[PDB]
Design a protein around this ligand. Structure first.
Ligand SMILES: [Mg+2]
Ligand SMILES: [Mg+2]
Lengths: 415, 415
């Protein structure tokens, strides 16, 4: 028996010709999130409602609908109901949803709930923009030079979760097949050996890279960088790079720069020549620190995207305010990107900035760009005013310490 | 017919009871390296010779012996002789060797020559210390807080080079086996799909972690951090973490801190309690920027170690002066960690700091700690004096620009 309540007032968003049809009163599913989700989610709801109200003068209003996943789901639906089938159904049905951080249990063989949501809903784009907000305390000298957008492939790579435990019958079966049937000789220690599988496909790669290039065109960005470790992993990471460049050539008229390998893609709207290039992943983690201004849109595989998004967020002082979206062809799920921080849960203390900026991304995705712009403006003003939560304030002199809820108010005040 | 010349004066280092027996006149094989190897290698030879001469008053002297790998090997031994068998034999026979950067060709199905050397010689430790040298221009505000030592597992992980090309008979054979025999359902796109294998073993893990803990004890370090992505890759990365903690318990008397999971290991020489802890890899790339002082010795798998060593090097301004060793139970190969930078090759321009500090590590490994200390002192003085190569100088005001060879002289001058 479902415990979700469909709002009496509200219409569902629909999808036609690859375009969202968003009514003035859209029903938006939201997952509160565990731990500090109880603090940041109500701040997000208030801030989004204010931005919507101010932008469209009361003509538009979101009908929020609570749905369940994580620790709260077990309390609502019962033991071991960590991810109800209806949550998958509802997100797909209502097209656009948002969630706080999620608790994935240990000891019950349950894999990451975040990853489960991404994979089961085929949300193959993990979209993570990282920019600097003036006034944010940062560990680097020039965080303002960082303005990048990560397209992280969300459906393949070693995240597929194909692996077998050392000394298990399955692992030994796989290892025997590799050694005796594939003639594999390069497993250093075949005994007591865990095994993981890393897939990378042409279709998987190209749908991700296609979205990254379309984003660069739509938003007049300067370049798309394919980041990969293709010199060591030729047939997965290296193939990702090859297919990315091929896609730029075959679908976007990519032309060779100089003697290559970089390509230029002409923006059909602005005439700007978008550079398509590539960087080896370890070097890239250096280049984002040393030459951040040379990078813009980034396209990379699942694990590399995980690392890159964290590293970039840290450097701009944005560990706790990094927005994120998981986008597929039929629906999209925006998310707080930090953890659940249970020690602070319910103290109205932690930074709601991440889930709020994810909500900004959500509004933009819905075509409600005015409301989204108001959130960005409010976030810029509040941070610039040094009226901030403890995680910022502890690193600054002369800041005003705000509760989580109060920081939400400051954002609204600066819209 | 070998083109290596064994020095008439010189004795080979031997190994007894796991201890190097280094004579006063050791023969040390060296690989010049391709590209800028022609610049940095002679600077290294001069600097090492000066340090040895000054430390031991002419009682000791290295008999350098050139051996071949990379582009130079093809010119010495002929077409497609990129890595002669004798080079493997010689490094093993002479126990301690050093190399400049290597060119690995593209288009001939040759995998990384660096990786080949590590794997064929079973040099399972990639040892990369990263500290700050005062005066170095850095992109971060507090690089002096970074003083870490990376133990990167060098023999397993996705570096095993087990993989098959998309649409190849082999890949399809593997994919069929996975789907039909292992009942694998989580490959999103089984067609046009490259496949890689990720092994992690108990013996591989423990020999690496054992070296990391022994290093912490020997050098009175504060903690060993196991870095892994075990929440997603349970049976490889997660197993690495489990086996690392288990090793600390079973071999080093590790005791539980509080309610865990951190352990304390008592240094048998100093009484210091060494903390054994762990951090998820994406978070770790944040924590090295945000809380670098909380980290010391790091133990991690091959790919993560690749990324971590690059990220740390970048942050301390050490991209071009990061030392590295590849150490096994029978021999050790110290290396320039940067690339070959062919555009500057032969211009006496690039920074010899990396290969010089790798040589410092080499001398220390040989038990010639006085000579090693002189190199560290000379490097500290030269950099502090702002008498530096262009890669530093271009980022500074009021520095004196030195050629590669001149920077080597400055190091000697500051010993
Ligand atoms: Mg992550
Ligand atoms: Mg590397």
């Amino acid at each position: 028996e479902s415990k979700v309540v469909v709002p009496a007032q509200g219409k569902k968003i629909t999808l036609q010709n690859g375009k969202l049809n968003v009514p003035e009163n859209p029903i938006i599913p939201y997952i509160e999130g565990d731990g500090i989700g109880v603090d940041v989610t109500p701040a997000m709801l208030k801030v989004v409602d204010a931005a919507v109200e101010k932008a469209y003068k009361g003509e538009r209003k979101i009908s929020w609908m609570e749905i369940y996943t994580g620790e709260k789901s077990t309390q609502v639906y019962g033991q071991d109901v960590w991810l109800p089938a209806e949550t998958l159904d509802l997100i797909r049905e209502y097209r656009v949803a948002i969630m706080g951080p999620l608790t994935t249990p240990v000891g019950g063989g349950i894999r990451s709930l975040n990853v489960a949501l991404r994979q089961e809903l085929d949300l193959y784009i993990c979209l993570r923009p990282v920019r600097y907000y003036q006034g944010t305390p940062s560990p680097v000298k020039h965080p303002e030079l960082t303005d990048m957008v990560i397209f992280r492939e969300n459906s393949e790579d070693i995240y597929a979760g194909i692996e077998w435990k050392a000394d298990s019958a399955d692992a030994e079966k796989v290892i025997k097949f590799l050694r005796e049937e594939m003639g594999v000789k390069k497993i250093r220690f075949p005994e007591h050996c865990g095994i993981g599988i890393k897939p990378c496909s042409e279709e998987g790669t190209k749908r991700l890279v296609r979205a990254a290039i379309e984003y660069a065109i739509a938003n007049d960005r300067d370049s798309v960088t394919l980041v990969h470790k293709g010199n060591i992993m030729k047939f997965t990471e290296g193939a990702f790079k090859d297919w990315g460049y091929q896609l730029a050539r075959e679908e976007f008229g990519g032309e060779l720069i100089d003697g290559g390998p970089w390509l230029k893609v002409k923006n059909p709207n602005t005439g700007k020549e978008i550079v398509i290039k590539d960087v080896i992943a370890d070097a890239f983690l250096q280049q984002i620190l040393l030459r951040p201004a040379e990078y813009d849109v980034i396209a990379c595989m699942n694990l590399n995207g995980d690392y890159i998004s964290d590293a970039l967020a840290a450097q701009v002082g944005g560990i706790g305010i990094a927005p994120g979206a998981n986008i597929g062809d039929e629906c999209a799920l925006f998310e707080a990107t930090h953890g659940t921080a249970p020690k602070y849960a319910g103290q109205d203390k932690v930074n709601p900035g991440s889930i709020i900026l994810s909500a900004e991304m959500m509004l933009r995705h819905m075509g409600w760009t005015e409301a989204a712009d108001l959130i960005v403006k409010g976030m810029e003003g509040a941070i610039n005013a040094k009226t901030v939560t403890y995680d910022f304030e502890r690193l600054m002199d002369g800041a005003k310490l705000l509760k989580c809820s109060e920081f939400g108010d400051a954002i609204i005040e600066n819209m």
